[PDB]
Design a protein around this ligand. Structure first.
Ligand SMILES: [Mg+2]
Ligand SMILES: [Mg+2]
Ligand SMILES: [Mg+2]
Ligand SMILES: [Mg+2]
Ligand SMILES: [Mg+2]
Ligand SMILES: [Mg+2]
Lengths: 677, 676
DNA sequence: AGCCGAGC
DNA sequence: TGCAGCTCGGCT
DNA sequence: AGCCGAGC
DNA sequence: TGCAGCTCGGCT
């Protein structure tokens, strides 16, 4: 009676209410599948209503948020529930329009979270209903077609699982999962889970209690929530971000690509199994370059990707904005290192690696940030050039210098107040005895938000505060801040006595006591200092420069051997020592073997990293026998031989220094061109 | 005076006060244009400029119903913001004191659809307040975020005012927007198309409404027909043609998301419109329920809609996949691509002016379109009957008449006369209390029939009494089955009258507007489908002639190419020629002196408007081995035979080969569809 | 009270 | 993630 | 009173 | 085509 998306049961509200089931689905697409499966007979005792994703965690949400939540209220009216009302006896159960709620979500982790949020909602307001068997779920395999829907519902018994309340263990499990006062308990809860899962990874491998649902099904979401929200220390990426970079590297676009088009390409090439809107969000976040976002954006923002006016919220639609790799991206993630990574497999398709190994700790450059379950991560930005200098110091066996947070193009100051605590201050100075000027806001204070929440209440006053200024004007650009503020002589004197930065809200505190990351083994770890992050990154990256040299010696050696055989075959051919004309394939192969020619050395070497093949010789064109091509082939062979020796003479440290120098050169050119443009 | 219930309005600071008549309301084409306008206005612009966005085309209020005008959110928002009043004259300055803005400035894209929005706004002011046009009420802002502030700083260079100069302006606006002036629009556009052909055999700040209509809006009306009226040759409109051109170039072997393909089409074919229209077109090309396509060229992999809701129940284009049908390239043979005139956007090659299918696809899937002045509507026709008529005409026989035919339609289509048909569903008496409905007429959707026919029969429906006692549904996704219960009395009287009549199971189909573009791009009205079939036949037969001339030349060039390659290989394995350690230029001159031909395929392709022996010397060293020499000799002889076998065949023979190959796969595909 | 961002 | 208005001509 | 579909 | 709710943890 007033619920647009509701397909109410025919007998709902009448005398057969307690025999009616309300099916709450995960989204409208799931609703139509349920309505399709119920046929026509299902309308008498089954209603369908869709949930628009995650619902409110009512256990500790404010009363205002609970009263104004449309989805919670819709469920209450459809079922006929009432707050504070107990459902103990059978007399109280008559005011309900439905006797059972059947949750129908995807059989993935986020579906389990929605189930738990519904369980948390009923358990917090009507615990007596759970002891009556009010909640159940409809299981599916792994959405599907209309024909499959009617086959699931025809076999309703095999897909219907009922939740069971068995004692206070169920209350404690629900509280463990959804109470804000149980964050530390969730840390221990997940710590035991991650530890136990490693033990069995080294070895092997119709009723459901709420305690078993929390501790055996919901925990898979909570852990997966951390795996997708807490970045890796090695490359500073989360898996979704890493899939984007992997796709951009594999495409190697030389011209702009629409963000929406790229998102579709990422989902296909990297097996991204979530909605594309989140993926398009990730791409926009990876491309932003305004003050307070990325110190080095790996994707270029070609279009309106947001400004410091609205903290990037003013970005245009992803169907109208373009992007492509920054020229620094491949200097930070050298393509040769791809041969050293562990690439994952989804549906037997090879996808992104478990991590990339950049030349500097990218987790410190762009400020890794993420919210999971139990833990969260928050890192500020750090200066790329200072990071390089500390890497160069550690390569010389010296201790790295301490580092303060640093944001590109930020004109203010960041001062250390204590361990992992910092004061971030904008810029304000007195012009005359009636004027101050504000030329910088602290990091992540957006211009429009500062205007509306600080300067307008200072100009007009509120119901709780007086006016402080008489006027202000704005002279901003898209990337800078300039407020000119007018005050009386008296008010300005009082503002200076109290502190201009304090009065004008131009100083904010930055506290970094939750630097939680996945280490290189995939273990969640809390890091107390950025130096600890830098050190753990340094040893791994240096070791991989060792692996890269071993790889290059083998690969360049095989290429040298290959050119030696090809050059030998051409020289022996243009002199009459060997002939192939009108010879059979069998005789030609057995002859090349008998004369000491090697099977494809590059293919052999690549297969070693896991009949004779002379195609690398006989697929050469007939041009190969002509004079200029013989001279060209001999010079290429001799040049590769010198290339092997030049590489053998370099240390892993030398290779790292070459990469760092090449990166700094392009970083200077790009950042200088940015200031020109 | 202020406005507070319109979220998307950025009202001017002085609007509503004493400076109202000096304030300008900027109406933009969409929210993105609004944000660009507020960006360009700086800070000073907020005092005398308001901005409000229009969400696309607005209501043509001329001759629109009173209910539609009263309930239109865009029209009412404009009235509330400006302060206008219906039936009020604005002659003197005393009447102008009730307006909150003195001017409206239209800001649209400088394309045809933007011109249409300008005209629709002009039509709205002209129909209700013609006195305002005589005061200079309407103006426009021309374009060719930082660029926005530069446009507004140079405001008067971009600002053009509309001018009323006499009854020619009233007549011009009425010509464009009055339902009583369709025939005048036909004449209006016929002269334009004719005048444009003549000049292609050879080579201010005020603007009157008559010049805007006859020199700017007419460009929209014409391009509206070019994108909405299909071509006779392939049955496509340009947007549909860009999609198939893109699918052909991609040649996907696996399913592709519709939204992804739409983005691929915009890039590869220079599609300059919104993605939503393009995703519409793709879904429409893929649908295969009863009443849509007889041969869908794209496969519907996912929920593309059903006959339950006429396809409006299709899932989002982000969740459904598509791919070429195996029939598409049998209908549009790739070899014929070498005969088409491909178009150019900027400097990129895009889709052709038309494809030339082996059968008139314009009849198979029912061409349909609404333009300006004209519209097109064709029913579906049977593919096999059309193949049979093509075979008859190839043998000099007369083609059989064809009735409309819809795939999987179990009903009846009867000819009442020329271009007039009775389309009937199926209903039969089960017992003396039950009828059963097993088919609805073509394009009557199941849910619509239930709500608009069966429910009024079951319930009240105003003065008419209830006629049935109950009904049950036993539909599938592709079939219809209603079982209806009645008393013996009202069933007998319903049976006494027409059962198909009483239950609304008969619809008429009239096709007196078969308007298409002919092969030259001329708009033409066809009286019968035989006229369409004949004109298609003469063109397609001629192009099978061109295919033979093209293939004989190309296969001949390939034959010459292989002859030289085989000659070089035989002379090399015998010692008659050596290349070892010879310089490039000596080897080139040596090959010339022995009669070796420069690349014959390249020469032939350049003929269709130093020596190149790369086709010989890029061959691998494998070429000199025994098995590769025998293989090269056999390939050379097979191409020679292929050229000769082709020169003996007639263009009719090639057409019959294609038709048989098409029918063979059509039988296989349609048998697999009925199994699934 | 609300940001941050990868999910629904 | 799902959802919504209009044009234009012929026809019912 | 509204469908059909390529556009905004 | 633009628009909108929520989770989860640390912190202001
Ligand atoms: Mg899911
Ligand atoms: Mg960041
Ligand atoms: Mg446009
Ligand atoms: Mg059609
Ligand atoms: Mg009409
Ligand atoms: Mg919170």
């Amino acid at each position: 009676k007033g619920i647009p998306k509701l397909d109410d049961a025919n007998d709902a509200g009448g005398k057969h209410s307690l025999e009616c089931t309300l099916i709450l689905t995960e989204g409208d697409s799931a609703k139509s599948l349920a309505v399709s499966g119920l046929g026509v007979i299902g309308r008498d005792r089954y209603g369908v209503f869709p949930l628009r994703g995650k619902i409110l965690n009512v256990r500790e949400a404010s009363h205002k948020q609970i009263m104004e939540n449309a989805e919670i209220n819709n469920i209450i009216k459809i079922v006929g529930l009432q707050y504070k009302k107990s459902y103990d006896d059978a007399e109280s159960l008559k005011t309900l329009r439905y006797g059972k709620i059947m949750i129908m979500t995807d059989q993935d982790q986020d579906g389990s979270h929605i189930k738990g949020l519904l369980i948390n909602f009923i358990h917090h307001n009507w615990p007596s209903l759970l002891k009556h068997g009010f909640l159940e779920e409809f299981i599916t395999p792994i959405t599907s077609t209309a024909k499959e829907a009617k086959e699931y519902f025809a076999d309703m018994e095999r897909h219907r699982i009922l939740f069971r309340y068995a004692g206070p263990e169920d209350d404690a499990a629900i509280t463990l999962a959804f109470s804000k006062k149980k964050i530390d308990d969730r840390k221990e809860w997940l710590t035991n889970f991650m530890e136990d899962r490693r033990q069995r990874r080294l070895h092997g491998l119709k009723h459901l209690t709420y305690n078993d649902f929390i501790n055996k099904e919901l925990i898979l979401f909570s852990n997966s929530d951390n795996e997708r929200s807490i970045p890796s220390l090695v490359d500073g990426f989360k898996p979704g971000q890493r899939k984007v970079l992997f796709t951009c590297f594999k495409r190697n676009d030389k011209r702009e690509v629409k963000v929406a088009q790229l998102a579709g390409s990422v989902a296909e090439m990297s097996a991204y199994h979530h909605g594309e809107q989140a993926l398009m969000m990730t791409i926009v976040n990876l491309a932003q370059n305004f003050v307070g976002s990325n110190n080095i954006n790996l994707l270029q923002p070609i279009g309106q990707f947001g400004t410091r006016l609205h903290g990037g919220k003013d970005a245009a639609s992803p169907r109208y904005i373009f992007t492509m790799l920054s020229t620094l991206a491949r200097l930070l993630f050298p393509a040769v290192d791809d041969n050293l990574l562990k690439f994952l497999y989804d549906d037997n398709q090879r996808v992104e690696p478990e991590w990339y190994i950049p030349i500097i700790p990218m987790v410190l450059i762009n400020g890794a940030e993420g919210i999971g379950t139990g833990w969260a991560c928050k890192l500020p930005n750090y200066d790329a050039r200072e990071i390089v200098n500390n890497v160069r110091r550690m390569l010389d066996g010296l201790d790295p210098h301490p580092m303060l947070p640093n944001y590109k193009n930020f004109k203010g100051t960041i001062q250390e107040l204590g361990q992992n605590q910092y004061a971030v201050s904008g810029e304000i100075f007195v012009v005359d005895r009636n004027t101050v000027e504000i030329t910088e806001l602290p990091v992540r204070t957006w211009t429009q938000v500062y205007k509306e929440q600080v300067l307008e209440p200072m100009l007009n006053g509120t119901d709780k505060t007086p006016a402080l200024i008489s006027d202000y004007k704005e002279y901003h650009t898209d990337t800078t801040v300039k407020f000119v503020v007018k005050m009386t002589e008296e008010k300005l004197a009082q503002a200076e006595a109290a502190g201009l930065h304090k009065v004008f809200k131009l100083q904010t505190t930055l506290t970094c006591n939750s630097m939680v990351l996945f280490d290189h083994m995939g273990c969640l770890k809390k890091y107390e200092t950025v130096q600890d992050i830098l050190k753990e990154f340094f040893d791994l990256r240096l070791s991989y420069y060792g692996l890269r040299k071993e790889w290059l010696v083998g690969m360049l050696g095989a290429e040298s051997t290959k050119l030696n055989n090809q050059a030998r075959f051409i020289l022996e051919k243009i002199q009459g020592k060997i002939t192939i004309e009108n010879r059979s394939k069998k005789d030609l192969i057995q002859m090349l073997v008998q004369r000491g020619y090697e099977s494809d050395p590059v293919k052999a070497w690549k297969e070693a990293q896991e009949g004779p093949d002379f195609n690398y010789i006989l697929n050469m064109s007939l041009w190969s026998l002509t004079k200029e091509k013989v001279e060209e082939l001999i010079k290429q062979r001799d040049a590769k031989g010198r290339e092997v020796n030049d590489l053998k003479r370099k240390s892993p440290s030398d290779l790292w220094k070459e990469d760092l120098a090449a990166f700094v050169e392009e970083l200077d050119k790009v950042e200088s061109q940015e200031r020109e443009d």
